[PDB]
Write a protein that binds this DNA or RNA. Structure first.
Ligand code: K
Ligand code: K
Ligand code: K
Ligand code: MG
Ligand code: MG
Ligand code: MG
Ligand code: MG
Ligand code: MG
Ligand code: MG
Ligand code: MG
Ligand code: MG
Ligand code: MG
Ligand code: MG
Ligand code: MG
Ligand code: MG
Ligand code: MG
Ligand code: MG
Ligand code: MG
Ligand code: MG
Ligand code: MG
Ligand code: MG
Ligand code: MG
Ligand code: MG
Ligand code: MG
Ligand code: MG
Ligand code: MG
Ligand code: MG
Ligand code: MG
Ligand code: MG
Ligand code: MG
Ligand code: MG
Ligand code: MG
Ligand code: MG
Ligand code: ZN
Lengths: 155, 51, 118, 49, 110, 64, 44
RNA sequence: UAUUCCUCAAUGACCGAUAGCGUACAAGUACCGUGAGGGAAAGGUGAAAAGAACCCUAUGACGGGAGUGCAAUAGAGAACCUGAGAUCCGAUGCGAACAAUCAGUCGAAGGAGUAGUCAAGCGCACUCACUCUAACGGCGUACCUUUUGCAUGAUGGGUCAGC
């Protein structure tokens, strides 16, 4: 019934530019692919975007009856918050103005259409084609599952 | 080439005909322009005007 | 009138019987409205009272268009002139006239092409 | 030296264009401990260690 | 002039010249001056276009514009340049008839 | 190193311009830096040819 | 560098104290002006 | 007859939070100075606190539901009625990596989205239909002040809101 489910986190103590630099990476990705990419991206904002995407999937599953295996990230954007004004002291008796920033993050998810599922199945076959940004965000990486093996007789 | 001889002339379009010029090595030149006319161009480096 | 079909259908006259801005439109109703009604049989003239508001003439056309002219603080001659302007119009939108000669067949003998022989 | 004029939104966006992040082509997850890791990262050794 | 009336005319302007009143007031006035000048320049531009089309149509049969228009003046034919250009574009045989009549009227020198 | 410039003096008051190039043009006519001006950058690792180099000996058993 | 304010409590009380202001006619006008303005710290 | 450190009552074509006293709010306070002295900022949930029990995801609810309430972006801890602009991040349509300039104006191929009218046979052509974008062509050296005269490489202005 409900098409779009959102999750908002307020009062993050980081820069809106720095948060948006990671939030723009995961736009239009599937949820379980974005969650994997945020665990190998080495940034401070990766944990925050992980938390907000996790909460969005949980809200869609629990409150509004959506299927968690078929969620795609429609929107992910950053707004400002309460900036704190301090004074920076230079040499020669002069001063400037320093800002401690705060932001808010909003993540909006929706269910993948069957036509988009056919698109994903067409993209996952092998081809040498150059992919556009939408298709590359739909098929971002190759997931490889490995098991640990003791005494694999070699080196 | 400008399509100025067609009654449906519009300035902002490109509808000229295709010109095929034959025997370009037998063009006529009057006077002393063979030894007195020069083509000059500057290649961008200082002091490098060529003729 | 487009190909014989009159386009203005309803002429609403909204006024007020107390306020001072409706003196012109009030005096227009006793003087010029019966002549306009008599000379316009196909047109429907509607009269509305709205106390404490400014008066206007509203024209409702066949192509689902409404045009409102506020006639506050006016003379009966100006009110009649704007009623005539409402009657004489087709109700099309007020934009710039692109062309002053509208045709669908620009040529009878055929437009000049490159393959025309004489 | 000081900037002569204010940098517009068009020029700021063009400058910050190539510096946006890009996704990682290969991602490995261990089937036992479930850690998401890059290639050449050690998480678990198998049984009878 | 109002602030909102300038913000209506600055609709579609690139940059900060559609948001800020100081920047939008300068660019709107230049646009209004250009519109006032181009209301006079359009007439010259259109008349030159008509002369180009009439001349292109007439030189196909070997008659210049300068001879052709004076032949139609001599025969008391008062079709103006706009209608003549539309005839050259859309009615080639009537235009050829007019060229023949003008050639019989005023052949000129050469 | 690149163009064998002389640089500036090591003493006698010179300040923070010991190995710099100095001037890079004239003032206001031309008001620009001419093309081909000698400036720091990547050096070497290019293709070069040595002419008239003399064959002394040949070892065909080992192809030397 | 040696700055201008070098504190000393006895010097402060001996120059700008209550009984140092109360001792001369200018300081009594200072005290009256302060009380009329409404200062919380009438004396130093 | 003069004045108001004071008291009581009344009035205003006096002001209405950058206004009115410096102070509508614990102000001659905070803060600056050795000292005399200088001297701010900051109003409003709702009729009534009924100020969100309980569930889910995070270290943590300020989030998503549930509930109270006419209304929940009416959800605050010296601040929540209305909620403009500069400014920041997204979405949809068109332009956009072989073409230069006060960034517009006059024409304009194409692309995209959406309406209505009714006589005749329930189609189809009519409303130059309407809205957004604009490949390409012509033309075009900002504003103010001061000057005999400024695109001027003369002055002034980062932008917005209030005064
Ligand atoms: K409300
Ligand atoms: K143009
Ligand atoms: K100067
Ligand atoms: Mg420092
Ligand atoms: Mg210091
Ligand atoms: Mg600054
Ligand atoms: Mg700053
Ligand atoms: Mg030397
Ligand atoms: Mg040396
Ligand atoms: Mg040194
Ligand atoms: Mg020094
Ligand atoms: Mg005040
Ligand atoms: Mg207010
Ligand atoms: Mg305020
Ligand atoms: Mg003190
Ligand atoms: Mg709560
Ligand atoms: Mg209220
Ligand atoms: Mg805005
Ligand atoms: Mg777009
Ligand atoms: Mg191109
Ligand atoms: Mg350029
Ligand atoms: Mg136009
Ligand atoms: Mg169009
Ligand atoms: Mg269309
Ligand atoms: Mg030009
Ligand atoms: Mg002078
Ligand atoms: Mg003068
Ligand atoms: Mg001039
Ligand atoms: Mg200047
Ligand atoms: Mg300049
Ligand atoms: Mg001056
Ligand atoms: Mg300046
Ligand atoms: Mg202002
Ligand atoms: Zn493992």
């Amino acid at each position: 019934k409900r098409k779009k489910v959102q999750a908002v986190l307020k009062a993050i103590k980081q820069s809106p530019k720095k948060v948006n630099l990671v939030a723009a990476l995961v736009r239009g990705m599937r949820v379980e692919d974005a969650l994997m990419q945020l665990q190998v991206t080495v940034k401070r904002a990766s944990h925050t975007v992980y938390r907000v995407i996790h909460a969005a999937r949980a809200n869609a599953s629990h409150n509004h009856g959506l299927d968690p295996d078929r969620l795609i990230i429609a929107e992910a954007f950053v707004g400002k918050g309460l900036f704190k004004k301090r004074i920076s002291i230079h040499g020669k008796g002069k001063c400037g103005l320093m800002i401690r920033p705060e932001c808010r993050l909003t993540v909006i998810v929706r269910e993948t259409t069957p036509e988009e599922e056919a698109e994903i199945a067409r993209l996952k076959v092998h081809n040498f084609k150059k992919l556009t940004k939408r298709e590359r965000r739909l098929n971002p990486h190759k997931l490889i599952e490995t098991t640990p093996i003791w005494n694999r007789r070699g080196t | 080439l400008q399509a100025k001889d067609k009654p449906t002339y519009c300035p902002n379009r490109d509808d000229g005909d295709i010109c095929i010029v034959l025997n370009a090595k037998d063009i006529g030149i009057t006077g002393r322009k063979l030894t007195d006319k020069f083509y000059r161009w500057h290649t961008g480096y200082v002091g490098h005007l060529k003729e | 009138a487009l190909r014989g079909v009159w386009q203005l259908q309803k002429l609403v006259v909204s006024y007020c019987n107390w306020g001072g801005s409706s003196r012109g439109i009030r005096a227009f109703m006793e003087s010029e409205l019966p002549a306009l009604i008599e000379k316009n049989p196909q047109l429907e003239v509607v009269t509305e009272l709205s106390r404490g508001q400014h008066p206007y003439l509203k024209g409702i056309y066949r192509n689902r268009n409404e045009r409102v002219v506020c006639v506050k603080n006016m003379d009966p001659d100006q009110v009649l002139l704007n009623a005539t302007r409402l009657r004489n119009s087709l109700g099309r939108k007020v934009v710039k006239l692109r062309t002053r000669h509208v045709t669908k067949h620009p040529s009878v003998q055929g437009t000049w092409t490159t393959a025309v022989k004489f | 030296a000081v900037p002569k004029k204010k940098v517009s939104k068009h020029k700021r966006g063009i400058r910050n264009g190539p510096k946006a992040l890009k996704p990682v082509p290969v991602i490995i997850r261990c089937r036992s401990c479930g850690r998401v890791k890059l290639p050449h990262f050690f998480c678990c050794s198998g049984e009878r260690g | 002039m109002n602030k909102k009336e300038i913000f209506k005319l600055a609709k579609g302007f690139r940059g900060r010249a559609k948001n800020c009143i100081r920047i939008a007031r300068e660019r709107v006035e230049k646009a209004l001056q250009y519109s006032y000048r181009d209301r006079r320049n359009k007439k010259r531009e259109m008349r030159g276009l008509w002369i180009e089309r009439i001349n292109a149509g007439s030189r196909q049969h070997g008659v210049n514009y300068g001879n052709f228009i004076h032949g139609l003046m001599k025969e008391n034919i008062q079709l103006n340049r706009k209608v003549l250009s539309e005839l050259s574009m859309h009615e080639p045989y009537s235009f050829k008839a007019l060229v023949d009549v003008s050639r019989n009227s005023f052949p000129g020198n050469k | 190193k690149r163009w064998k410039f002389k640089g500036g003096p090591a003493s006698h008051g010179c300040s923070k311009a010991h190995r710099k190039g100095g001037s890079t043009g004239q003032r206001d006519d031309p008001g620009k830096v001419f093309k081909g001006r000698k400036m720091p950058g990547h050096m070497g690792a290019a293709q070069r040819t040595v002419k008239n180099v003399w064959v002394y000996k040949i070892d065909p058993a080992r192809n030397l | 560098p040696k700055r201008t304010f070098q504190p000393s409590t006895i010097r402060r009380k001996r120059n700008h104290g209550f009984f140092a202001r109360k001792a001369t006619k200018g300081g009594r006008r200072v005290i009256a002006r302060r009380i009329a303005k409404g200062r919380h710290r009438v004396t130093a």
